Amino acid sequence: ATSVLIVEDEESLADPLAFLLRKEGFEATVVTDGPAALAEFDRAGADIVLLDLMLPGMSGTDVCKQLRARSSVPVIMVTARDSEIDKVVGLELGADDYVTKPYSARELIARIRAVLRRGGDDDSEMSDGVLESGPVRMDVERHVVSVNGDTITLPLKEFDLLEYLMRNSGRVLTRGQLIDRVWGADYVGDTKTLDVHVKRLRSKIEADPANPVHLVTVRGLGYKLE
Amino acid sequence: ATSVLIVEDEESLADPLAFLLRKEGFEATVVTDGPAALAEFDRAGADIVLLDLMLPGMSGTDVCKQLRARSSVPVIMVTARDSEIDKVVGLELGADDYVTKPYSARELIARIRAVLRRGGDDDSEMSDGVLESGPVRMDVERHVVSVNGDTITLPLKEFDLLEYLMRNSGRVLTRGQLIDRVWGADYVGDTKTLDVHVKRLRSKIEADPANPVHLVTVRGLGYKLE
Ligand SMILES: [La+3]
Ligand SMILES: [La+3]
Ligand SMILES: [La+3]
Ligand SMILES: [La+3]
Ligand SMILES: [La+3]
Ligand SMILES: [La+3]
Ligand SMILES: [La+3]
Ligand SMILES: [La+3]
Ligand SMILES: [La+3]
Ligand SMILES: [La+3]
Secondary structure, eight states: OOEEEEEOSOHHHHHHHHHHHHHTTOEEEEEOSHHHHHHHHHHHOOSEEEEESSOSSSOHHHHHHHHHHHOSOSEEEEEEOHHHHHHHHHHHHOOSEEEESSOOHHHHHHHHHHHHTTTTOTTSTTOOSOEEETTEEEETTTTEEEESEEOOOOOHHHHHHHHHHHHTTTSOEEHHHHHHHHHSSOOTTHHHHHHHHHHHHHHHHOSSTTSOSSEEEETTTEEEEO | OOEEEEEOSOHHHHHHHHHHHHHTTOEEEEEOSHHHHHHHHHHHOOSEEEEESSOSSSOHHHHHHHHHHHOSOSEEEEEEOHHHHHHHHHHHHOOSEEEESSOOHHHHHHHHHHHHTTTTOTTSTTOOSOEEETTEEEETTTTEEEESEEOOOOOHHHHHHHHHHHHTTTSOEEHHHHHHHHHSSOOTTHHHHHHHHHHHHHHHHOSSTTSOSSEEEETTTEEEEO
16 A cells, blocks of 8 residues: 655644554554655665754754655655744745735734834833733743733734733824734724724623723724723 | 745735735835845845745745744745645655645545646547537636636536536536546535535536426436436
8 A cells, every 4th residue: 555654743643643544454553753754665665755944953944855865656744843943944045034925015014013022022112021000911932911811812903912012001192003013014904803803802801891991992093901 | 023025026015015014013115036036135125024835946844944044033925825835745746746734635535636637638538629518618628618608616626517417528528427526535524515516517508497408317326416
């Protein structure tokens, strides 16, 4: 039967695939690094190779070239998390990030603005340590928020919105400021989306999300966290 | 203001990003190949570089290394369509495909089975030319189907289902065969999903999708295209 060599350092991704392959009549062998991959290919061969692009020691890039050097027969499919391809282009090209295209222009602008303010660090924007305002605490470097207890998923946009409001506690931020920061650039329907997001935060942060007293609207101006 | 160098061979991706950047107070310069990128960086510099990974001539991989060699300051973000990263890993590593992880195991199995039958070619599975059955015509190599006129989106699963039924016109295919081929491996709820997909095809292929006469159910066995 067709032989699949799975080269993968996450046992919990590899084992279920290996299970399914086997129940479907394929042979599957799982190995966890480049040396073990090359030894097993030489021992037994493989018809299909599924290759983790980021491995400890010998890079997946080098494993791939070495397998291909041995035979033109095997199908070799390289696999990577967003975070692994980001690491690989850093090590291999000196790139700061990899992004799959078509991508939202505005979202890319929001990421550019973030880089320029050293986004994701407590020590950015002349601050230090965890942000606090009323019962809300935000650990920016760890990406966690509590409202006494740890507050559930904040989707990314809600987190960014709250961070920007907490960093400017007691001061009004305008719709334009808030939109540029969280969504990147102004766009059709942005004011409504901002308000939906403010209301979602309110339901997670406020004693009564109906008459809010912490995340308030400043009519004609924008929003403020007191 | 912050300068963004956009290195991109698709004017219709680059120009709208450049527009938005400019309206948000950034400088943006768009160039369309590696030589032009390196000349412009040397002329004017850039704070941010957005770099198409696949370019004509000098590869985006080589541009990236050459820009980084010049300065450690610029943020360099490499961008690629699914199809461009697939091409790059072929040229650079000898890999047949790149896949972003976590990925459906079953879907990966369906792609393995497809490779093994030389999927997507008219000449595969002892056939030749376009498939025809009743009013339905399928050009497998071009990925187009007509029912007299060109039949709308067939989502991929519907296309695969129909192809497999057309290749075996007049013969019953079982639920197990159909599931293994289109979805890759058996799974919880597969029989129902198969039927939903058969009904969706019926609404696109059949005179009356209520009493079907072309794509028929064979009770106890599976489905058949007459
Ligand atoms: La173990
Ligand atoms: La194990
Ligand atoms: La890994
Ligand atoms: La990334
Ligand atoms: La703006
Ligand atoms: La033009
Ligand atoms: La132009
Ligand atoms: La390109
Ligand atoms: La791919
Ligand atoms: La099966």
